[PDB]
Each structure stands twice: as C-alpha cells, then as structure tokens.
Symmetry: C2
Subunit: 274 residues, 2 copies
C-alpha cells in the first residue's frame, strides 16, 4: 500500500505543487485551456504579421512590456525586448518558487545564487514549453498568441532565437506532463550540484536526492500508463543545456550588431560566464 | 519479467566481457596495485615517451615514417588510432543487444555514428584516475599533467575527459552496470536522421528497466543512483560537442592520404 516512507514523499510533492501555483500565475492547466478551446472568454488575439501585430499592440498591453526602448523602427527588436522583459519576469517567479524549496534557503548564500544563475534558463524554457504548441506561443499572460512562423521570419539573427525553444517544446510536450509534475521537476533542476563554483556541493545533493525520490513516486503515481517516464524525463535535461547555450551564442552576436540595444541587468548578471 | 531484466543483464554482461578486452575490474587491478606484478610503464615526460616508442612498442600507431617527428602530434595521432579500435569493439557489442540487429539497417548505422563517441568516453573513464590514463591495452599509463603539458590546442583535448572521469567514477559502477548503461546510450531514440524510433525506444525502455534493477541489487546502499547516472548522459553530450569543437582548431595544424580516409 503506502508506507511511512512514501508518505513523506507525497507530502513533499503536495508542498511543491502548492508553492508552484502560488508562484506562477500562468500555469500549464490554464495555458492548455486557453490553447485548446472549451472557451468563449479565454481566447487570445493572434499575431502572425505586422498588421495583426499592429492591431495586436492595440487590443493588448504592449508597452508595459516593451521597455521605454519604444518606437524602434525594426519591430524585431521590439519583439526581442518584449521577450527579455518577460524573462526577467519569469526569473523573478522562479526565484520566488526556489525559496519555498525545503532546504534551499538554508544554504550558503553564494551557492543559493549559483543554482539560480544556471538553473534559471533551463527552467524558463521548460515552463515556456507549457505555453506552446507546434503552431506558436502564448504571450502577455495568455491574452495573446504569436505564431511560430511570424517569429521564424523576423530579421536574420532575431528570426532565429525561438525555433530551438519550439523544437524542444514539441518533444517535451509529448511527455504530457502536468503542473504537479513540472513543479517537482523544476525543483530538481535547481538543486543540481554540477553547477560551476558550488562551494558546498554535498548538502545540495542530499536535497536533490529527496526531490528525485519525490519525482519518481509522483510520476509513477500520476502516470502508471507511462513506463520509464522518470528516465525519459531526466534525459530531457540534455536538450535544455544546448538550448541555453545556443541562446547565449545569440546574445553574443546581438551585443555587437546592435550595440545600441540595451540589456536588462538581471539578465546580464545571469548570462556572464555561462 | 522480474526475471527477464536479470537475464538481459547477465547476457549483456557476458557479451560485454567478450567484446571488451580491457575491463573496468581489470583496469582497476592495474592502476591501483591490488594483485599486480605486470606494473605499467609510466609516461610523465618527453623521454619516458620516447622510451615508450620501442618499449611498449605501442608504436602500432607510429611506424608511420616521415610524419612521426613532433610529440604532441603523434600522441593525439595515436589517441585517434585507439579510438577506431574501440569503435569496432563497440559496433560488435551493439549486435549483442537484443533487437539491435532486427532494426532497419540505416538506423543501426545511425545509432552507431552518433553513439560511439559518448561510449568511448564512458569507458575511457574506466581507464582513468585523477592523475592519468591507461594506454596500449593497459601496458602503459600516460600521466595527466604531461597531457596538459601539451603545447597548443593539444593541451586540452584530454583534460575535459579527465574532469568527466572524476565525477563519473565517483559512481563506483562496475562492468555489470556499465554493460547495460552502454546499451542505453546506443538505443537513443533521438539521434538525427532515424527512420523508425518506436522499436528503438521500446528497446531502450527495456534496457532502462534492466539497468534500474541492476543498480538497486548491485547498490542497495546508493540511493537514486539510477537518476544520477542518467544525468551524466548530459555531461557526455557537452563533452562530445566540445570535443568535436577542438577538432575544428585542429584543422589549423601540421603546416597518409589513405590514413586520413581511415580517420
Ligand atoms: C519570448 C518568450 C519569453 C518567455 C519568458 N515568450 O514567448 O513570452 C517572447 C517572444 C515573443 C514575446 C512577446 C512579444 C510581444 C509581447 C509580449 C508580452 O508578454 O506582452 C511577449 O516574448
Ligand atoms: C586518447 C584516449 C582515447 C581512447 C579512445 N586514449 O587512447 O586513452 C589518448 C591519449 C593518449 C593516447 C595515446 C598516445 C600514445 C599511444 C597510445 C596507445 O594506446 O598505444 C595512446 O591516446
């Protein structure tokens, strides 16, 4: 049945699902409902071109997003800027979620930061998977949907920063994970141990050890139907590393062809040295 | 199938033992000391190398005259030769894996083209320790520092593999564990260009169940080892991508036609 052992683990699972919902306004469940239908009130405004993009800015909040680097002739940059701000947003949330992870705050302050430094993007693109389908991605809190095609056609460099994300989202979404799973999986990602510079690695590993244990049970209980989902899920941590690095490559490029474009501080401190 | 995962294991093990000459247990026998007389010829610098030329006569990879005149070039040169040696040992082990032969010819090739690198490094860990690597069927042992001691790009083509070994070996896996682990890497359903992924995954899924059981029985003590091992698969891709990058700069050197073709 259930033993004292598994029980501790299910409680950890529930504690995290609870923090998860409390930290991310736009969950996978909400996003799915928005993407699939079953709705009359949650349908998004679709953007697939400059005009729709134009009427787009109109129906939805596209200026508290585009930092003051406003009216910047090339739309591509405007878009990129929207994306960047939304990432800073995500970092913040993830940071909020992190603190709730049992044991995380009790660590060396420099390490707390190190885990965030590298775990953050791997997480953003994991969660970003939740707002995408092969056709495109949700934006502005779900109120909108930008076509994968619109993005892919943007100015030479820019029109290339989202494809990898889409490539992964398709694979990853095929795992059919739900919000309660992702909450634990994201936890595991934070408590790595192989992050560069980690002063006291051991305590971090004992934490992750319990999380992996929590995820194993969770996946087994939530997805009997799917065998070795646990394994298949972990293997996916490879795709994340590469997506991350490709992006970084891209930031390098932009930091030159566009020396007039600004960068958000928080995103700066993260990137440096990845 | 509680018993099936055990049979797939012994079989893979049995097969692994037959395909690979230098095993973990053995390589371990050497390195350390435990039951050893044969003791390896250490290569820590230039002259210890030279003496190696004719001693271990490891030169299976050097008789290559008029092109055998510049240390850092012949070592890496050699390294590659032993790689190609490993590839054949791997390709052969592949055929032992239940179902491998039954897959589409082109996919068998593809799994191999994109999997041998990751496996070369996993087994290479068996021949390393923080201070060096076992060469020529374990007759020698080339020191770690002498390698960083290599001039130009040649000073960091083994260092990465060394860092990996250190972390990997920390798992204390044996040949029994590795055998199944190797099979998993091969049966990767996400290699580019495949044609029929289902059969592959079906097999990897079966191999994964075997590994999981193997690790629990062989290491009751070590909690979540299965998880930690699968994570290392990530360490590998980084390493294989990176390695492949050094090959780029390496294009800018030494400035036979069949030799290249060979490689
Ligand atoms: C990049 C991602 C960022 C995820 C943290 N995203 O799809 O949200 C991206 C691509 C396009 C946009 C975007 C364009 C215009 C307006 C917005 C908005 O949130 O208002 C986002 O962001
Ligand atoms: C590189 C590794 C790669 C194995 C597939 N290795 O052979 O352990 C490497 C480093 C040094 C050498 C080497 C130099 C000279 C002679 C030999 C030999 O095996 O006889 C190896 O290879």
């Amino acid at each position: 049945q259930l033993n004292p052992e598994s029980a501790d683990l299910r409680a950890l699972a529930k504690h995290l699902y609870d923090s998860y919902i409390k930290s991310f306004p736009l969950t996978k469940a909400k996003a799915r409902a928005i993407l699939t239908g079953k709705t009359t009130d949650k349908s998004p405004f679709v953007i697939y071109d400059m005009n729709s993009l134009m009427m787009g800015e109109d129906k939805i909040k596209f200026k508290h997003i585009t930092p003051l680097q406003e009216q910047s002739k090339e739309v591509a940059i405007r878009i990129f800027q929207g994306c960047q701000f939304r990432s800073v947003e995500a970092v913040q949330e993830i940071t909020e979620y992190a603190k709730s992870i049992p044991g995380f705050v009790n660590l060396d302050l420099n390490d707390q930061v190190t885990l965030l430094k590298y775990g953050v993007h791997e997480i953003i693109y994991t969660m970003l998977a939740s707002l995408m389908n092969k056709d495109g991605v949700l934006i502005s809190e779900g109120q909108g949907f930008m076509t994968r095609e619109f993005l892919k056609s943007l100015r030479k460099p820019f029109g290339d920063f989202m494809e990898p994300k889409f490539e992964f989202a398709v694979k990853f979404n095929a795992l059919e994970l739900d919000d309660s799973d992702l909450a634990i999986f994201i936890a595991v990602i934070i408590l790595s141990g192989d992050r560069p510079g980690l002063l006291n690695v051991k305590p971090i590993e004992d934490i992750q050890d319990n999380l992996l244990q929590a995820l194993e049970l969770q996946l087994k209980l939530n997805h009997p139907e799917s065998s070795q989902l646990f394994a298949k899920l972990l293997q996916k941590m490879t795709d994340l590393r590469q997506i991350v690095t490709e992006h970084v490559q891209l930031l390098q490029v932009i930091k030159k062809t566009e020396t007039d474009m600004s960068l958000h501080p928080l995103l700066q401190e993260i990137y440096k040295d990845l």
